[PDB]
């Protein structure tokens, strides 16, 4: 069900060496930097970026770096990544890319300065892919009346690896597909399993290669030593991104980083604490049932302990929401291995239903267990609308519904400022 | 309690550019290849190795490769790794190293050809370190009347990382310390946590660096894409080595490899199936209690399913033995989260009590749970003496005891050829 190559959506911007696949993300820790990334296919081109604010039209230039990679019998075009920095908060910015030959203009708006009661609305999309369904989700999100300002991307980007030799063209199509959204608003990236691409047979054995060349993150802004896990503060939220397919052993770098990072969170500054990951820790569908177990046995307590608000995952092509629940009592022989409501525990939501290759996971465990608050096998996206330091309203729009129909909806009470039972 | 630098044990072989830190390991999948590794400190030197069999004294030469690494303000000497191959089975071999200036002679014996009833005796040492205690273990093993022929090394080699800036000299001392054993009989290597050495502060952030330069394994012989996990067949046993601090997510390379590898095991050819890892899956001591949980939730079933015989780990500086037990029934809400005797499950033994920096873990969970068959906080090593395709006799010598005193002893009944209850 993957949109074919001719698809209008996959069309290449006209012009010799026309910057295609333009896509941006947060470039620093708190909001005043952007990473502009694009691809030129005719010849290398200039990695410079021209930008200026709407108000003070003083045009400035930032210079980036260009790279290329080979996959198997594939060869990338020229990939460029430039980082504009020291932007002013809350400001529309105009940036042009492709200065040497055919220039393309775009705009993005710096977010507000980090704050206790600074509202912001994130869209949640995970497991996008490039089926027609995916097209639909992307448009539903594009139209949600409460308009999203940043997309938290929970993993599995293009499924190019389903194609033979992971036909990296499918990475180029996807890049072009999603441009309409990403060239204007950042998408926070999360490594999914489809990103791994461990292909020994074709002699590709460096995990996350194509992904890593195409998508960059300010991992160094947190003090991560790897792009596969990092964090960003934006508006009022503090976002930690983890890697299910990287390592979390005790003492390993991801483990070491997450621990320290959790201690660096300041709720007085960023009331909302959100965590992202691909494989979900709490899941009641049959598909991938219990994979999150390992990472669960490692990070749950921390999450409960620091009172993280929500945890979004993908990986299960469907939707599900949970009760604020923990299960941190088991000690092997003591039999306390059953999830209990705990109000310090986060609400685990899974939204890997944005489309993939057009297939939904419907087989679920009968009957819906206590921990599971609401679950449905439909394609859709989500929105997490932060209001105050106490309120944030999550929503779930189904692809079947009209753009403004909230198939599911929930008010989040800040685990830190207003810990009242938001459970139902 | 770490033996000081002057220690006779740490002495440098006399001679200009005298090959020091000589140490060998299996170089192929089935036994007819050796990897000779040494270090020259004065100048690069020749990476050639001269070898010949006792019988046919036709001296041959194998050429290796030389490398060096810098750690922080440290700089290795010249490390050499040469692989002699196509050796004859069961044959004493003589090899000389350091041909250009001061040559040193050693010998090793190829093992017997892989077989159903081929006996062999492995020594188990884990968590060695370089305290006086360590010295003692090494000697106890050196004297065990049933003489070991290969040492299965369960992780944590030298604890150089306890020193400041991980003073890599301590890696050089350890290398010299253990030479008396390793230059003559292979030690199968397992990455321990102390091997990770993730030191961002001193700008060292590549996991396992010093370890990886100094110790090499025939990972490519299995079809591993990383030295951190591999397998070797020797005598009658099939040995799988895993990495607790590498990644095991579903789809990750280690995960992918272990699965396939387990399918490649032929019990009709190698009756004994042994698995190595550092962090133990079943552990009743307080120290590191429940760390193996994650990797457990991922590989246990496989082990039960393939009927692996034993699983050795280190990490807990003490000793413990278990009942053939599984705990593969939990499905979250069903409460079946308690270990039961299962005769298809392996016996999990932990021997991280070879010495470390001279400290034993004694705090254990009271009372000793059902799954735990025998546990004690003493320094020691182990021997796993394979007899037939049905019998193998494990033993545990305490450092307090005399060389031939088996503080613990157990007969192993082959999970495949003779699955009778060896439990007690
Ligand atoms: C890559 O190889 C496949 C067959 O192995 C072939 O069909 C395909 O067209 C090739 N692609 C390129 C860009 O050469
Ligand atoms: C591209 O830009 C260069 C320099 O601006 C110019 O000389 C060249 O002719 C342009 N057109 C093409 C097709 O390269
Ligand atoms: C994708 O959706 C856009 C609008 O949402 C539409 O203009 C376009 O034709 C669609 N293309 C496909 C292949 O669905
Ligand atoms: C490439 O193809 C397969 C993958 O394992 C193998 O036969 C071959 O050795 C691989 N590597 C090279 C360098 O050809
Ligand atoms: C939080 O927002 C809700 C509506 O979402 C509102 O009713 C409530 O009074 C707000 N709290 C503050 C402190 O303004
Ligand atoms: C490395 O630095 C430490 C202090 O940072 C110093 O005491 C030590 O002697 C140095 N080692 C070398 C080999 O320079
Ligand atoms: C080492 O060997 C070389 C060549 O065999 C020789 O010329 C040299 O003088 C020897 N001695 C030293 C100290 O290098
Ligand atoms: C280590 O043990 C050996 C024999 O086992 C002995 O000769 C040596 O002196 C000992 N050294 C230390 C520092 O214990
Ligand atoms: C080296 O020391 C610390 C480690 O994080 C840091 O201050 C510095 O930036 C590091 N890197 C370099 C290149 O100095
Ligand atoms: C296995 O070895 C034991 C002693 O360890 C012996 O009693 C038994 O008969 C042997 N089995 C075979 C088939 O020889
Ligand atoms: Fe997916
Ligand atoms: Fe240890
Ligand atoms: Zn997935
Ligand atoms: Zn350890």
Swiss-Prot record, chains A, B:
Fe cation binds at residues 127, 156, 159, 317. GO terms for molecular function: acid phosphatase activity; ferric iron binding; zinc ion binding. Its EC number is 3.1.3.2. The active site is at residue 288. Pfam families: Metallophos, Metallophos_C, Pur_ac_phosph_N. Glycans are attached at residues 73, 101, 135, 203, 388. Zn(2+) binds at residues 156, 193, 278, 315. Keywords: Disulfide bond, Glycoprotein, Hydrolase, Iron, Metal-binding, Secreted, Signal, Zinc. Optimum pH is 6.1. It comes from the Eukaryota. GO terms for cellular component: extracellular region. CDD domains: MPP_PAPs (cd00839). Its cofactor is Fe cation; Zn(2+). Binds 1 Fe cation per subunit. Binds 1 zinc ion per subunit. Its main location: secreted. Inhibited by compounds CC24201, CC27209, and MO07123. Inhibited by the tetraoxoanions molybdate and phosphate. Not inhibited by EDTA or tartrate. It is found in: Secreted. InterPro entries: Calcineurin-like_PHP_ApaH, Metallo-depent_PP-like, MPP_PAP, PPA-like, Purple_acid_Pase-like_N, Purple_acid_Pase_N, Purple_acid_PPase_C_dom. PANTHER family: ACID PHOSPHATASE RELATED, PURPLE ACID PHOSPHATASE 10. Homodimer; disulfide-linked. Belongs to the metallophosphoesterase superfamily. Purple acid phosphatase family. This is Fe(3+)-Zn(2+) purple acid phosphatase.
């Amino acid at each position: 069900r993957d949109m074919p190559l001719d698809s209008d959506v996959f069309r290449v911007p006209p012009g010799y060496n026309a910057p295609q696949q333009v896509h941006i993300t947060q470039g620093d820790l708190v909001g005043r930097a952007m990473i502009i990334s694009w691809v030129t296919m005719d010849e290398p081109g200039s990695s410079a970026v021209r930008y200026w604010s709407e108000k003070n039209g003083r045009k400035r230039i930032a210079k980036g770096k260009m790279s290329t990679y080979r996959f198997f019998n594939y060869s990338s075009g020229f990939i460029h990544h430039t980082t504009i920095r020291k932007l002013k908060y809350n400001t529309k910015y105009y940036y042009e890319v492709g200065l040497r030959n055919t220039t393309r203009r775009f705009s993005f708006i710096t977010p507000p300065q980090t704050g206790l009661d600074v509202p912001y609305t994130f869209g949640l999309i995970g497991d996008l892919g490039q089926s027609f369904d995916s097209n639909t989700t992307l448009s539903h999100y594009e139209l949600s009346p409460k308009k999203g300002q940043t997309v938290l991307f929970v993993g599995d980007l293009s499924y190019a690896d389903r194609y033979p030799n992971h036909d990296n063209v499918r990475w180029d199509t996807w890049g072009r597909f999603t441009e309409r959204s990403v060239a204007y608003q950042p998408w926070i990236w999360t490594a999914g399993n489809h990103e791994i691409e461990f292909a020994p047979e074709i002699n590709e054995t460096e995990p996350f290669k194509p992904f890593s060349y195409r998508y960059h993150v300010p991992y160094e802004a947190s003090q991560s030593t790897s792009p596969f896990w990092y964090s960003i503060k934006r508006a009022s939220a503090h976002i930690i991104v983890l890697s299910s397919y990287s390592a979390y052993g005790r003492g390993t770098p991801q483990y070491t980083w997450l621990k320290k990072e959790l201690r660096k969170v300041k709720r007085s500054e960023t009331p909302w604490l959100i965590v992202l990951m691909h494989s979900p820790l709490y899941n009641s569908y049959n598909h991938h049932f219990m994979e999150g177990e390992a990472m669960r046995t490692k990070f749950e307590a921390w999450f409960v302990k620091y009172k993280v608000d929500v945890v979004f995952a993908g990986h299960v092509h469907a939707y599900e929401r949970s009760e604020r629940v923990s299960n941190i009592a088991y000690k092997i022989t003591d039999g306390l291995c059953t999830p209990v409501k705990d109000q310090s525990a986060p609400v685990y939501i899974t939204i890997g239903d944005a489309g993939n290759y057009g297939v939904i996971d419907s087989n679920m465990i009968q009957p819906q267990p206590e921990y599971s608050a609401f679950r449905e096998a439909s394609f859709g996206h989500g929105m997490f609308d932060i209001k105050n330091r106490t309120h944030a309203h999550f929503s779930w729009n189904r692809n079947q519904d009209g753009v403004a129909v909230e198939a599911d909806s929930v008010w989040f009470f800040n685990r830190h400022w207003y810990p009242v039972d938001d459970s139902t």
